[PDB]
């Protein structure tokens, strides 16, 4: 199988090397590939490298972004992406091909490369509060605002585990500005909502920021 | 660059379902195709390589078939492990490229959003900036129109949308549009609607506080 | 130096299939998995044609629609091979068939070439050639051999066992309706040397090891 | 399909003069996808020149390649001995790939007239049962001619066949044969077997011919 280096947040104008472990088959009998995959553009095929003799392919598109190289004792393959910008966001692939035959069937879990201007941030958590009524009878809806974060992931939980039911916690979206926000949501009876203690047990990694918050009615206009 | 393009672009089935997903390449490609799954999350897996041949490993419900432009998948009785996005993705002429995906969805019976408003929190609006968020809750089909309306003035260019993957026991969705607006400029104001069109709905339903 | 290396010529029934090779040899040949592998041929008349080719990499065929099914091409990787065969044949795939390459996995230009394969079809059978006189009327002078009904080709001919070179002319062959060659041998020469001069012309045909001489010589008159 | 038609079917010029060779491609194409190509007799194809302008590595510099959109250009600055050959352009843009029909570039010389003469069948062939009778046309420039074959002032039509040799290393001469086959039944039931050649080096039609019976 296939497995890549981690995932990277990374800065405008840097660089990244990222790699790619074949095991369990003849590392030399296969070509080794580069995808990446983007909302934007889909999937596109950045080049491709033989490991015998260290032979390239590349996309026109990604021509000098990426160069592919290869070590052959290690049986891993690298690439190489330079003078970085924010559109180079993406996830991206390692997969195979063999001259035989097939295929692209293997395919390494993927890297994510994130480049932003933007520095390390914690959340800013907002009670996104019960309004006073109705709805339709039951039920009624709350939730919490996790707002500008950088960068993803941040893990909402409610009342930690006692609440994996009914909760959407959506996923997040890239503000202008550069920022994430998200937004987590539960729905629970429209009866207790005054009977039971919610807090958001947001914490968010990338800075060691773990935020509780409760929601309640708030009673003015 | 060969053009490949998948029809059609989204799905619905249900378990046992023969299911077809096809690709048309802008120019003869001689079977040098592959299909791919990917579900969330996910790594690709290749399916079927060189038109008609079958991964190792690939359940045999799984086949590919086609000439020159036109290539179709074929799903004999569809698997729950089967729910996911398919890809063509062509290796006659340089570069290879990809189909922009057929995802391949649950189908149930329709369901309605129940909608949800609320107004910023307290403590946001002593910064600069008040977001207010739109809920729509379990609903089916995926399409789905949120228009806020501010003093019942339709507005454009400073919501976000955001759509959960289909739940693992209603098969619905969920949907969270947030508005976001200077405290300045939030102060008109307080009639805030967020109005839903949907096909489970008679007519617009309507949240405002 | 890309040096091709293409089988040797062949001669086939119609209805049967020619299976031609292409041997990459070469100090500077490289990665032979790495280029793409072009098929084309040139029948007499016409332009050369496009067959279709094996990419590198992958190893897979392009094929011109023309021939889609007819023809099949594949590479062996480990003897840097590459293969053309063409099935049902008919008189009208009598061609020179060639294999080339160029610089990319892809086919472009074509850089390099193998030396060619010639493929005749015909329902022939090999027949060595009757000759006849082409008598110089009397009335410079002309006179020749008739070299008739052979195959296949080549026969070549010369005079007075190679003594007489200056003022000869041998033709190319002609195919008749009789599926079989025809050819002639002219030399011109002085008139006054139509008694005196002895001329013999020296047909010869491997293909049947058939080596016949005539003597050529005014007729009465 | 990209069509490539190529212009003209045979360039007639001498040594050391330019050769200008056309090819017309059937629709835009990006000159990124265009070749041009050398076939010497006997010999593999050369590649000259890829990407429409870029010469080959290894190739004199007295060729270049221009052009863009539809028509390309194939130059030859001077033409030495060795450039006496077929050209064909290909292009690899789309599928198939394609080429032109090839243009012939030949060596001009003064015109000169054929030697005709006219060979009747031997009695050795006669024997059996096919008659050729051959037209010689020998040593001429330029290689149009035209030779027609009357039997007893009957012009003949698809009984016979013609055969050009190479344009000649030392005098840059054709010669041409053309023979007619009948058989000995239809040989033997005329009289008068003519052979005549029109040909610009002729102020007037060459005829040669014989008369079954001179035995």
């Known amino acids: 199988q296939l497995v890549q280096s981690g995932a990277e947040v990374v800065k405008p104008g840097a660089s990244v090397k990222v790699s790619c472990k074949a095991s369990?088959?003849?590392?030399?009998?296969?070509?080794m590939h580069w995808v990446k995959q983007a909302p934007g553009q889909g999937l596109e095929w950045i080049g491709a490298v033989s490991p015998g003799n260290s032979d390239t392919s590349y996309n026109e598109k990604f021509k000098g972004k990426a160069t592919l190289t290869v070590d052959k004792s290690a049986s891993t393959a690298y690439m190489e992406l330079s003078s970085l910008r924010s559109e180079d966001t993406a996830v991206y692939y390692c997969?195979?091909?063999?001259?035989?035959?097939?295929?692209?069937?293997?395919w390494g879990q993927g890297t994510l490369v994130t480049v932003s201007s933007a520095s390390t941030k914690g959340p800013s958590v907002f009670p996104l509060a019960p309004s006073s009524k109705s709805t339709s009878g039951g039920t009624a809806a709350l939730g919490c605002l996790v707002k500008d974060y950088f960068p993803e992931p941040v893990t909402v939980s409610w009342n930690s585990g006692a609440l994996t039911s009914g909760v959407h916690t959506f996923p997040a979206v890239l503000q202008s500005s550069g920022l994430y926000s998200l937004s987590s949501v539960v729905t629970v009876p429209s009866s207790s909502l005054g009977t039971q203690t919610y807090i958001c047990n947001v914490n968010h990694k990338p800075s060691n920021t773990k935020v509780d918050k409760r929601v309640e009615p708030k009673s003015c206009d | 660059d060969i053009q490949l393009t998948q029809s059609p672009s989204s799905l619905s089935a249900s378990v046992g379902d023969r299911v077809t997903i096809t690709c048309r390449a802008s120019q003869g490609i001689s079977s040098n195709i592959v299909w791919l799954q990917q579900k969330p999350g996910k790594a690709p897996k290749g399916l079927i390589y060189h038109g008609t041949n079958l991964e190792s490993g690939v359940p045999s419900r799984f086949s590919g078939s086609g000439s020159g432009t036109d290539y179709t998948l074929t799903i004999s009785s569809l698997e729950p492990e089967d729910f996911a996005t398919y890809y063509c993705?062509?290796?006659?002429?340089?570069?290879?490229?990809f189909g922009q995906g057929t995802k391949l969805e649950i189908k149930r019976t329709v369901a309605a959003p129940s909608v949800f408003i609320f107004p910023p929190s307290d403590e946001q609006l002593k910064s600069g900036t008040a977001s207010v968020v739109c809920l729509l809750n379990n609903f089916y089909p995926r399409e789905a129109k949120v228009q806020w309306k501010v003093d019942n003035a339709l507005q454009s260019g400073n919501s976000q949308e955001s759509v959960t993957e289909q739940d693992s026991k209603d098969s619905t969705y969920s949907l969270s549009s947030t508005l976001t607006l200077s405290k300045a400029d939030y102060e008109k104001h307080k009639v805030y609607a967020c109005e839903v069109t949907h096909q489970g709905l008679s007519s617009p339903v309507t949240k405002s506080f | 130096?890309?040096?091709?290396?293409?089988?040797?010529?062949?001669?086939?029934?119609?209805?049967?299939?020619?299976?031609?090779?292409?041997?990459?040899?070469?100090?500077?040949?490289?990665?032979?998995?790495?280029?793409?592998?072009?098929?084309?041929?040139?029948?007499?008349?016409?332009?050369?044609?496009?067959?279709?080719?094996?990419?590198?990499?992958?190893?897979?065929?392009?094929?011109?629609?023309?021939?889609?099914?007819?023809?099949?091409?594949?590479?062996?990787?480990?003897?840097?091979?590459?293969?053309?065969?063409?099935?049902?044949?008919?008189?009208?795939?009598?061609?020179?068939?060639?294999?080339?390459?160029?610089?990319?996995?892809?086919?472009?230009?074509?850089?390099?070439?193998?030396?060619?394969?010639?493929?005749?079809?015909?329902?022939?059978?090999?027949?060595?050639?009757?000759?006849?006189?082409?008598?110089?009327?009397?009335?410079?002078?002309?006179?020749?051999?008739?070299?008739?009904?052979?195959?296949?080709?080549?026969?070549?001919?010369?005079?007075?066992?190679?003594?007489?070179?200056?003022?000869?002319?041998?033709?190319?062959?002609?195919?008749?309706?009789?599926?079989?060659?025809?050819?002639?041998?002219?030399?011109?020469?002085?008139?006054?040397?139509?008694?005196?001069?002895?001329?013999?012309?020296?047909?010869?045909?491997?293909?049947?090891?058939?080596?016949?001489?005539?003597?050529?010589?005014?007729?009465?008159? | 399909?990209?069509?490539?038609?190529?212009?003209?079917?045979?360039?007639?010029?001498?040594?050391?003069?330019?050769?200008?060779?056309?090819?017309?491609?059937?629709?835009?194409?990006?000159?990124?996808?265009?070749?041009?190509?050398?076939?010497?007799?006997?010999?593999?194809?050369?590649?000259?020149?890829?990407?429409?302008?870029?010469?080959?590595?290894?190739?004199?510099?007295?060729?270049?390649?221009?052009?863009?959109?539809?028509?390309?250009?194939?130059?030859?600055?001077?033409?030495?001995?060795?450039?006496?050959?077929?050209?064909?352009?290909?292009?690899?843009?789309?599928?198939?790939?394609?080429?032109?029909?090839?243009?012939?570039?030949?060596?001009?010389?003064?015109?000169?007239?054929?030697?005709?003469?006219?060979?009747?069948?031997?009695?050795?062939?006669?024997?059996?049962?096919?008659?050729?009778?051959?037209?010689?046309?020998?040593?001429?420039?330029?290689?149009?001619?035209?030779?027609?074959?009357?039997?007893?002032?009957?012009?003949?039509?698809?009984?016979?066949?013609?055969?050009?040799?190479?344009?000649?290393?030392?005098?840059?001469?054709?010669?041409?044969?053309?023979?007619?086959?009948?058989?000995?039944?239809?040989?033997?039931?005329?009289?008068?077997?003519?052979?005549?050649?029109?040909?610009?080096?002729?102020?007037?039609?060459?005829?040669?011919?014989?008369?079954?019976?001179?035995?």
């Open positions: 993705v062509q290796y006659s002429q340089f570069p290879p490229t």
């Open positions: 369990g088959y003849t590392f030399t009998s296969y070509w």
């Open positions: 997969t195979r091909s063999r001259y035989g035959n097939n295929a692209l069937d293997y």
